[PDB]
Amino acid sequence: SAVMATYLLHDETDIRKKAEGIALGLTIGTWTDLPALEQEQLRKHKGEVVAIEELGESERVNAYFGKRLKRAIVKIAYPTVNFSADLPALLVTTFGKLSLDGEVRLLDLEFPDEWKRQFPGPRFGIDGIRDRVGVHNRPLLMSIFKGMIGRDLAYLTSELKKQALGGVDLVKDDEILFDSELLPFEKRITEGKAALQEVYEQTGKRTLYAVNLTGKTFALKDKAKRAAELGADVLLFNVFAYGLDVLQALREDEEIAVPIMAHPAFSGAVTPSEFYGVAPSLWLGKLLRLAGADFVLFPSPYGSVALEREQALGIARALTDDQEPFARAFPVPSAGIHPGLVPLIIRDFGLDTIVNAGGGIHGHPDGAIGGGRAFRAAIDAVLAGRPLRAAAAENEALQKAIDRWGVVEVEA
Amino acid sequence: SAVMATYLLHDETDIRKKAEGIALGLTIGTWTDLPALEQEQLRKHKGEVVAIEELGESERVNAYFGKRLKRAIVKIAYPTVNFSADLPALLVTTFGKLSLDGEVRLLDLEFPDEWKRQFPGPRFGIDGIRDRVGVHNRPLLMSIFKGMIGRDLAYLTSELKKQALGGVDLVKDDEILFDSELLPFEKRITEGKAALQEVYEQTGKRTLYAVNLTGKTFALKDKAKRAAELGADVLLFNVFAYGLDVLQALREDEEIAVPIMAHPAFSGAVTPSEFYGVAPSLWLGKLLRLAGADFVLFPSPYGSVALEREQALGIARALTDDQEPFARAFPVPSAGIHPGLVPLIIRDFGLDTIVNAGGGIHGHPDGAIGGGRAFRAAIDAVLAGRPLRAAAAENEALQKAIDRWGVVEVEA
Ligand SMILES: [Mg+2]
Ligand SMILES: [Mg+2]
């Protein structure tokens, strides 16, 4: 039983030698200097290089570093009896001291099924979320409050209703919205709920509110439990600013039992490099799903800072692969989103995704309501097998949006 | 009052545009469209671009990206009234969504003295640690257990004595040593304590044991309290696998009040890139000191994966700068350390540093005892104002080390 880590290494020295050094150094330390009695005793703890794939040199990389660097994908097996069954131990074992060893990037981690079962996975997952929001087939639609810092509860409820009246399925706090005297955590939840229950009357549409769960680590459980008691819909959580283990703790507390939406804030300090860090499919995908995120927002493959397409798809696959013993987590590609991209979003990610209108929903000629209607019309059009312009010719809200941002081609 | 973040940006679009966008977008969001009444109300919350230092375009960088990128250091002021007084809020505000914005690297964070005051700093610091171990003037000496995974308490005690008998001031668990039936956390503490007491009786030498504090986040405080009750000397903590806020929680708990040694494990997933992440002076230095680390181990500027000298010195400076309202934290340059490097270590870092013999101490011809004797002899030589070889001529352990690994010249 071992966790197999896959790394990308760049080095001017023999990679196999370095790899063997890692497998041994980060497990038992030494082997050839051990008596026979100790070798048999420590055998089960010995790490091993499972595979090495030569990638050939890159002149682009060589020029950058100013030297010839060999490249290779290295796989190392770390016996699970070597560490406790918790994420901090997993990270320290597979990428603790190793993260300091020059050019090494963690690409993936694979675990025996028995080890995976020691972790929770999402509590609700895609199926649970759809039931809680009451939308069973079409992809969901979410938006974000605009400029709420320094604003009051009257503004919050007002802006919340506008978005819900726009037909969005979920509205979340801006990740930088922290508790204040004007906007107390508990009050955002209770007033937000009452306000959304009003829109429920005016419009059968039921909208959820993902409230930001912030503050010090050891105060999180108490607040989350209170949120559950107050009937909060979803807890937005800046997991990377805390630790993966904290997300797991929130997921496993039966007194909370509220959906958790993981925000990508700070994940960029770890994922973008070609030579260092941890690949997004693992950092934002596999590990967050395993830890307990019901929703995972991640860099979309569209816009000014688009994540490489295959990377984005890799994240979504990790979140939804049904070969895993965990419920599926909702993939939410974020940033660079507009109604004209809905057709492409659905083609790339499928029906079980969430269209994140973000704060942009407010940039529609007719406010959030118009912005929400434009997105809902766009989603319906795609599912009905119709071109947006075709549907737009019958939907002004969508018409306005298309004229302002255009339509992205989905044909291959 | 406002926190000023300093960033390094690479981009093909106007840097000033992006800077203003960040200042506004990550604070109030909108300003021009707001009525004079709201502006005066939200003035307090408005972010501002403090300065922009244009840098010379880099041919190497342009060749790597295959595009011409302008470079600049941008400083942005974030009103402290915008976020709660905790590290997670600080990180999310200054490098949350921004960490996802292409090529942006966080270089530094400056806090108003008034804001810093809401954080603990080290509980003991350099002076407190020197008193706890009873060593003044000379730099301290520490070593690490070798090959403990899969071993028992009898082995731990025997290995601990060997190191203490070698004259080391502190011995720490390997950062990858997790709790097990063979080596329970509480047992390592009590058995280690007894063994170290026996050594004092024998040589009058005092040696501390830094025990690894691991496992799930919400079980840390309870076990740390037990450690304090059991008389643990120091708590080794893989902070980067848990979150900076957790370190602060351990520091602020009066029921713990045990020195904390922060390990660099996983910090390399964040610090190495030229274009992304967080600079080590901030990530390993300034923030860990503010959070409560009494010791900070960081990549040394020596050996196979040496950190650029200025970077290493920058970390030490942040840890010891007397201008901060926090006690100084012990700088511990780690990796690539051997007796022959002692003169340079002291010349580079001064006397208030710790020579980390690491696991290399066991590699001395005469085991850890000889290894420690070699290091102590080298330290005394520098303090006695004499060349290492002069002392080596009177100390066999030191000569063996020199002939084994050589002496690093310090003459400029
Ligand atoms: Mg936001
Ligand atoms: Mg170690």
Coordinates of N, CA and C and ligand atoms in Angstrom, one line a residue, chain A residues 144 172 174-176 263, chain B residues 97, ligand 1:
Chain A
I144 N -22.0 37.0 -8.3 CA -21.3 37.5 -7.2 C -21.8 39.0 -6.9
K172 N -23.0 34.4 -4.4 CA -22.0 34.2 -3.3 C -21.4 35.6 -2.9
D174 N -18.4 38.1 -2.1 CA -17.1 38.3 -2.8 C -16.1 37.7 -1.8
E175 N -15.1 37.0 -2.3 CA -14.2 36.3 -1.4 C -13.4 37.2 -0.4
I176 N -13.4 38.5 -0.8 CA -12.7 39.5 0.1 C -13.7 40.2 1.0
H263 N -13.1 28.3 -2.8 CA -12.7 29.4 -3.6 C -11.2 29.2 -3.9
Chain B
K97 N -7.4 36.5 -5.3 CA -7.8 36.4 -6.7 C -6.6 36.9 -7.5
Ligands
MG1 MG -14.3 38.1 -5.9

